[PDB]
mmCIF file of C-alpha atoms and ligand atoms in Angstrom:
data_model
loop_
_atom_site.group_PDB
_atom_site.id
_atom_site.type_symbol
_atom_site.label_atom_id
_atom_site.label_comp_id
_atom_site.label_asym_id
_atom_site.label_seq_id
_atom_site.Cartn_x
_atom_site.Cartn_y
_atom_site.Cartn_z
ATOM 1 C CA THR A 1 -33.860 -40.550 5.528
ATOM 2 C CA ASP A 2 -32.835 -37.057 4.581
ATOM 3 C CA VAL A 3 -31.547 -35.071 7.532
ATOM 4 C CA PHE A 4 -30.725 -31.469 6.641
ATOM 5 C CA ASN A 5 -27.678 -32.434 4.559
ATOM 6 C CA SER A 6 -26.886 -28.918 3.262
ATOM 7 C CA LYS A 7 -25.200 -27.734 6.418
ATOM 8 C CA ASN A 8 -22.140 -29.956 5.968
ATOM 9 C CA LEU A 9 -21.596 -28.160 2.674
ATOM 10 C CA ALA A 10 -21.986 -24.427 3.316
ATOM 11 C CA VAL A 11 -19.768 -25.409 6.204
ATOM 12 C CA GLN A 12 -17.457 -26.935 3.607
ATOM 13 C CA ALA A 13 -17.916 -23.689 1.679
ATOM 14 C CA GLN A 14 -17.502 -21.564 4.854
ATOM 15 C CA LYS A 15 -14.562 -23.788 5.814
ATOM 16 C CA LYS A 16 -12.441 -22.794 2.809
ATOM 17 C CA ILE A 17 -14.003 -19.473 1.955
ATOM 18 C CA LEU A 18 -12.082 -18.587 5.063
ATOM 19 C CA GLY A 19 -9.161 -20.717 3.831
ATOM 20 C CA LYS A 20 -8.072 -18.167 1.200
ATOM 21 C CA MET A 21 -9.516 -14.793 2.390
ATOM 22 C CA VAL A 22 -8.469 -14.094 6.036
ATOM 23 C CA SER A 23 -5.189 -16.039 6.249
ATOM 24 C CA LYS A 24 -3.305 -14.391 3.355
ATOM 25 C CA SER A 25 -5.180 -11.228 4.036
ATOM 26 C CA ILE A 26 -3.155 -10.602 7.220
ATOM 27 C CA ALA A 27 -0.792 -13.564 7.696
ATOM 28 C CA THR A 28 0.945 -12.368 4.510
ATOM 29 C CA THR A 29 0.696 -8.652 3.581
ATOM 30 C CA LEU A 30 1.096 -6.622 6.838
ATOM 31 C CA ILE A 31 2.159 -8.848 9.726
ATOM 32 C CA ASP A 32 5.378 -9.095 7.746
ATOM 33 C CA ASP A 33 7.365 -7.267 10.438
ATOM 34 C CA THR A 34 9.262 -5.664 7.559
ATOM 35 C CA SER A 35 6.000 -4.207 6.169
ATOM 36 C CA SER A 36 5.465 -2.784 9.665
ATOM 37 C CA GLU A 37 8.919 -1.169 9.679
ATOM 38 C CA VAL A 38 8.144 0.483 6.346
ATOM 39 C CA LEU A 39 4.736 1.637 7.661
ATOM 40 C CA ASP A 40 6.367 2.946 10.861
ATOM 41 C CA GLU A 41 8.853 4.977 8.816
ATOM 42 C CA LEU A 42 6.086 6.232 6.581
ATOM 43 C CA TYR A 43 4.422 7.297 9.822
ATOM 44 C CA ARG A 44 7.499 9.063 11.142
ATOM 45 C CA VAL A 45 8.243 11.000 7.952
ATOM 46 C CA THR A 46 4.599 12.052 7.778
ATOM 47 C CA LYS A 47 4.499 13.081 11.462
ATOM 48 C CA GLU A 48 7.851 14.806 11.020
ATOM 49 C CA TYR A 49 6.590 16.713 8.012
ATOM 50 C CA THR A 50 3.027 17.559 9.097
ATOM 51 C CA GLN A 51 3.984 18.262 12.734
ATOM 52 C CA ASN A 52 0.724 16.512 13.656
ATOM 53 C CA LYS A 53 0.775 13.088 15.342
ATOM 54 C CA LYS A 54 -2.859 12.303 14.625
ATOM 55 C CA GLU A 55 -2.926 13.418 10.986
ATOM 56 C CA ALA A 56 0.045 11.080 10.488
ATOM 57 C CA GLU A 57 -1.814 8.313 12.328
ATOM 58 C CA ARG A 58 -4.852 8.737 10.043
ATOM 59 C CA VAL A 59 -2.739 8.529 6.867
ATOM 60 C CA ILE A 60 -1.168 5.207 7.858
ATOM 61 C CA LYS A 61 -4.460 3.814 9.137
ATOM 62 C CA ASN A 62 -6.113 4.620 5.792
ATOM 63 C CA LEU A 63 -3.240 2.911 4.003
ATOM 64 C CA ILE A 64 -3.350 -0.200 6.166
ATOM 65 C CA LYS A 65 -7.140 -0.365 5.791
ATOM 66 C CA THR A 66 -7.005 -0.062 2.035
ATOM 67 C CA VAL A 67 -4.330 -2.758 1.644
ATOM 68 C CA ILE A 68 -6.268 -5.244 3.783
ATOM 69 C CA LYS A 69 -9.584 -4.716 2.028
ATOM 70 C CA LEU A 70 -7.747 -4.960 -1.269
ATOM 71 C CA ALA A 71 -6.137 -8.232 -0.253
ATOM 72 C CA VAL A 72 -9.435 -9.728 0.935
ATOM 73 C CA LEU A 73 -11.214 -8.774 -2.302
ATOM 74 C CA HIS A 74 -8.405 -10.313 -4.339
ATOM 75 C CA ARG A 75 -8.112 -13.570 -2.386
ATOM 76 C CA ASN A 76 -11.892 -13.939 -2.597
ATOM 77 C CA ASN A 77 -11.953 -13.814 -6.399
ATOM 78 C CA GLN A 78 -14.337 -10.874 -6.075
ATOM 79 C CA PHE A 79 -12.413 -9.290 -8.923
ATOM 80 C CA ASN A 80 -13.660 -9.747 -12.433
ATOM 81 C CA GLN A 81 -11.526 -10.061 -15.592
ATOM 82 C CA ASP A 82 -10.921 -6.290 -15.829
ATOM 83 C CA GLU A 83 -10.213 -5.747 -12.125
ATOM 84 C CA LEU A 84 -7.616 -8.528 -12.220
ATOM 85 C CA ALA A 85 -5.885 -6.906 -15.181
ATOM 86 C CA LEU A 86 -6.036 -3.622 -13.303
ATOM 87 C CA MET A 87 -4.682 -5.285 -10.182
ATOM 88 C CA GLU A 88 -1.810 -6.678 -12.190
ATOM 89 C CA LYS A 89 -1.009 -3.252 -13.568
ATOM 90 C CA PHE A 90 -1.248 -1.850 -10.020
ATOM 91 C CA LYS A 91 1.260 -4.411 -8.724
ATOM 92 C CA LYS A 92 3.669 -3.555 -11.546
ATOM 93 C CA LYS A 93 3.304 0.142 -10.856
ATOM 94 C CA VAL A 94 3.883 -0.284 -7.098
ATOM 95 C CA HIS A 95 6.958 -2.431 -7.798
ATOM 96 C CA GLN A 96 8.300 0.360 -10.011
ATOM 97 C CA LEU A 97 7.414 2.992 -7.421
ATOM 98 C CA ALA A 98 9.261 1.011 -4.760
ATOM 99 C CA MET A 99 12.414 0.663 -6.875
ATOM 100 C CA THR A 100 12.272 4.316 -7.985
ATOM 101 C CA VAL A 101 11.978 5.540 -4.409
ATOM 102 C CA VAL A 102 15.089 3.490 -3.617
ATOM 103 C CA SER A 103 17.025 4.462 -6.746
ATOM 104 C CA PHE A 104 16.392 8.184 -6.041
ATOM 105 C CA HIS A 105 18.197 7.673 -2.745
ATOM 106 C CA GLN A 106 20.846 5.188 -3.848
ATOM 107 C CA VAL A 107 21.939 7.232 -6.848
ATOM 108 C CA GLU A 108 23.010 10.596 -5.485
ATOM 109 C CA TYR A 109 20.774 13.553 -6.305
ATOM 110 C CA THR A 110 18.622 11.730 -8.883
ATOM 111 C CA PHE A 111 15.461 12.693 -6.961
ATOM 112 C CA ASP A 112 12.776 13.934 -9.327
ATOM 113 C CA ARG A 113 9.525 15.013 -7.685
ATOM 114 C CA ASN A 114 7.585 14.762 -10.947
ATOM 115 C CA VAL A 115 8.498 11.141 -11.572
ATOM 116 C CA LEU A 116 7.398 10.198 -8.061
ATOM 117 C CA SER A 117 4.134 12.235 -8.317
ATOM 118 C CA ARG A 118 3.324 10.666 -11.681
ATOM 119 C CA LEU A 119 3.931 7.142 -10.326
ATOM 120 C CA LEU A 120 2.005 7.772 -7.094
ATOM 121 C CA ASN A 121 -0.989 9.195 -8.935
ATOM 122 C CA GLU A 122 -0.975 6.292 -11.399
ATOM 123 C CA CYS A 123 -1.196 3.974 -8.372
ATOM 124 C CA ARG A 124 -3.969 6.163 -6.933
ATOM 125 C CA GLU A 125 -6.090 6.009 -10.092
ATOM 126 C CA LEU A 126 -5.513 2.297 -10.481
ATOM 127 C CA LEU A 127 -6.781 1.735 -6.905
ATOM 128 C CA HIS A 128 -9.899 3.872 -7.400
ATOM 129 C CA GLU A 129 -10.829 1.967 -10.485
ATOM 130 C CA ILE A 130 -10.112 -1.474 -8.932
ATOM 131 C CA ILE A 131 -12.369 -0.858 -5.917
ATOM 132 C CA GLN A 132 -15.019 1.120 -7.823
ATOM 133 C CA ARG A 133 -17.425 -1.797 -8.122
ATOM 134 C CA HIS A 134 -16.803 -3.116 -4.603
ATOM 135 C CA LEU A 135 -16.120 -0.402 -1.986
ATOM 136 C CA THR A 136 -17.959 2.632 -0.650
ATOM 137 C CA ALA A 137 -17.031 6.332 -0.521
ATOM 138 C CA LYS A 138 -15.052 6.033 2.700
ATOM 139 C CA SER A 139 -12.518 3.738 0.964
ATOM 140 C CA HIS A 140 -12.081 6.146 -1.971
ATOM 141 C CA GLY A 141 -11.455 8.891 0.639
ATOM 142 C CA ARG A 142 -8.793 6.788 2.353
ATOM 143 C CA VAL A 143 -7.147 6.242 -1.024
ATOM 144 C CA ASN A 144 -7.020 10.000 -1.656
ATOM 145 C CA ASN A 145 -5.848 10.879 1.855
ATOM 146 C CA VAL A 146 -2.896 8.472 1.528
ATOM 147 C CA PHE A 147 -1.842 9.550 -1.919
ATOM 148 C CA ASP A 148 -2.435 13.279 -1.309
ATOM 149 C CA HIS A 149 0.113 13.223 1.500
ATOM 150 C CA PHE A 150 2.767 11.143 -0.197
ATOM 151 C CA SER A 151 2.563 12.802 -3.616
ATOM 152 C CA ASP A 152 2.798 16.310 -2.049
ATOM 153 C CA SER A 153 5.738 17.979 -3.864
ATOM 154 C CA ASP A 154 7.011 19.792 -0.797
ATOM 155 C CA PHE A 155 6.780 16.581 1.240
ATOM 156 C CA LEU A 156 8.797 14.742 -1.424
ATOM 157 C CA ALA A 157 11.451 17.475 -1.655
ATOM 158 C CA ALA A 158 11.981 17.393 2.126
ATOM 159 C CA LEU A 159 12.116 13.624 2.254
ATOM 160 C CA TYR A 160 14.963 13.648 -0.277
ATOM 161 C CA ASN A 161 16.749 16.672 1.267
ATOM 162 C CA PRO A 162 20.109 15.175 2.217
ATOM 163 C CA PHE A 163 20.844 18.021 4.654
ATOM 164 C CA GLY A 164 17.803 17.899 6.929
ATOM 165 C CA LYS A 165 15.989 15.791 9.532
ATOM 166 C CA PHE A 166 14.711 13.360 6.879
ATOM 167 C CA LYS A 167 17.992 11.834 5.676
ATOM 168 C CA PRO A 168 18.133 9.063 8.285
ATOM 169 C CA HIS A 169 14.444 8.332 7.738
ATOM 170 C CA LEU A 170 14.925 7.964 4.000
ATOM 171 C CA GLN A 171 17.773 5.569 4.649
ATOM 172 C CA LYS A 172 15.628 3.425 7.016
ATOM 173 C CA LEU A 173 12.600 3.593 4.697
ATOM 174 C CA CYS A 174 14.764 2.433 1.779
ATOM 175 C CA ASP A 175 16.211 -0.447 3.801
ATOM 176 C CA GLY A 176 12.679 -1.596 4.552
ATOM 177 C CA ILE A 177 11.432 -1.226 0.989
ATOM 178 C CA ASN A 178 14.478 -3.103 -0.340
ATOM 179 C CA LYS A 179 13.872 -5.872 2.177
ATOM 180 C CA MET A 180 10.269 -6.253 0.877
ATOM 181 C CA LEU A 181 11.497 -6.197 -2.711
ATOM 182 C CA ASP A 182 14.220 -8.750 -1.941
ATOM 183 C CA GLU A 183 11.659 -11.088 -0.292
ATOM 184 C CA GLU A 184 9.426 -10.506 -3.317
ATOM 185 C CA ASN A 185 6.545 -9.083 -1.271
ATOM 186 C CA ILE A 186 6.333 -5.972 -3.464
HETATM 187 C C1 6OU B 201 7.911 8.205 0.064
HETATM 188 C C2 6OU B 201 7.084 8.333 -1.195
HETATM 189 C C3 6OU B 201 6.241 7.088 -1.450
HETATM 190 C C4 6OU B 201 5.733 6.387 -0.176
HETATM 191 C C5 6OU B 201 4.696 5.293 -0.497
HETATM 192 C C6 6OU B 201 3.332 5.551 0.141
HETATM 193 C C7 6OU B 201 2.516 4.265 0.231
HETATM 194 C C8 6OU B 201 1.423 4.069 -0.829
HETATM 195 C C9 6OU B 201 1.881 3.220 -2.015
HETATM 196 C C10 6OU B 201 1.466 1.891 -2.320
HETATM 197 C C11 6OU B 201 0.464 1.003 -1.508
HETATM 198 C C12 6OU B 201 1.006 -0.448 -1.358
HETATM 199 C C13 6OU B 201 -0.067 -1.555 -1.593
HETATM 200 C C14 6OU B 201 0.541 -2.892 -2.053
HETATM 201 C C15 6OU B 201 -0.508 -3.967 -2.486
HETATM 202 C C16 6OU B 201 0.145 -5.283 -2.860
HETATM 203 C C17 6OU B 201 -0.773 -6.219 -3.632
HETATM 204 C C18 6OU B 201 -2.008 -6.597 -2.838
HETATM 205 O O1 6OU B 201 -2.388 -5.853 -2.013
HETATM 206 O O2 6OU B 201 -2.659 -7.828 -3.058
HETATM 207 C C19 6OU B 201 -2.129 -8.911 -2.306
HETATM 208 C C20 6OU B 201 -0.587 -9.035 -2.458
HETATM 209 O O3 6OU B 201 -0.085 -10.192 -1.737
HETATM 210 C C21 6OU B 201 1.227 -10.124 -1.108
HETATM 211 O O4 6OU B 201 1.569 -10.983 -0.299
HETATM 212 C C22 6OU B 201 2.214 -9.007 -1.450
HETATM 213 C C23 6OU B 201 1.814 -7.616 -0.967
HETATM 214 C C24 6OU B 201 1.423 -7.546 0.539
HETATM 215 C C25 6OU B 201 2.172 -6.413 1.275
HETATM 216 C C26 6OU B 201 1.761 -5.042 0.762
HETATM 217 C C27 6OU B 201 1.272 -4.183 1.908
HETATM 218 C C28 6OU B 201 2.413 -3.478 2.636
HETATM 219 C C29 6OU B 201 1.937 -2.179 3.283
HETATM 220 C C30 6OU B 201 3.024 -1.076 3.229
HETATM 221 C C31 6OU B 201 3.810 -1.107 1.873
HETATM 222 C C32 6OU B 201 4.455 0.204 1.478
HETATM 223 C C33 6OU B 201 4.973 0.104 0.056
HETATM 224 C C34 6OU B 201 5.963 1.249 -0.238
HETATM 225 C C35 6OU B 201 6.142 1.524 -1.742
HETATM 226 C C36 6OU B 201 6.949 2.824 -1.948
HETATM 227 C C37 6OU B 201 -2.918 -10.184 -2.712
HETATM 228 O O5 6OU B 201 -2.493 -10.494 -3.984
HETATM 229 P P1 6OU B 201 -1.484 -11.677 -4.239
HETATM 230 O O6 6OU B 201 -2.016 -12.644 -5.230
HETATM 231 O O7 6OU B 201 -1.169 -12.361 -2.939
HETATM 232 O O8 6OU B 201 -0.115 -11.089 -4.895
HETATM 233 C C38 6OU B 201 0.205 -11.457 -6.227
HETATM 234 C C39 6OU B 201 1.729 -11.631 -6.309
HETATM 235 N N1 6OU B 201 2.090 -13.024 -6.100
#
């Protein structure tokens, strides 16, 4: 007759639900060994600047956590019409941030702390608004912890100081960002 036939379906649902959420979630955004180089450099410049190994650890952990959750949401079509448009603006703004970070190193002395703070904060606000309907307070805190550290004016000025400890880090960071850009991952 009619065995419990539903189970072959949620299973079909479960089967592919997984198919788009977990794979891309980590197979694609962070396990990209180049993403890890960039994150490692972000760690080093933060540790170098804060003189605190565990405050630097927490910044990068917050960042990695945010990116993953963001990916999973996206791949799961949990975003509505307005969150997708926001996400698309976010991606454009991060692309522009990435190229501006590089250009401020590649073109001598064009570093402008206000341009970078404006772009970083625009990313920050985009992220808050994207996750507003789907994440809790902890995630908003992670977003602020990450962007508070990187948009810090004195942090930015030191990172682009060509005479100090940070010069070789900026060079490595830029190599990594450019690699992501060239692979079209950002
Ligand atoms: C030194 C001063 C500035 C330092 C920067 C501090 C770092 C904070 C800034 C930005 C956070 C980066 C988050 C990137 C999110 C990318 C988009 C995303 O998460 O969604 C996913 C994107 O999917 C991808 O495969 C591409 C992005 C995955 C890698 C991004 C995560 C890397 C983590 C470290 C990146 C650092 C960026 C540095 C920028 C200056 C899912 O959407 P999609 O449909 O697959 O992509 C559509 C395009 N076909």
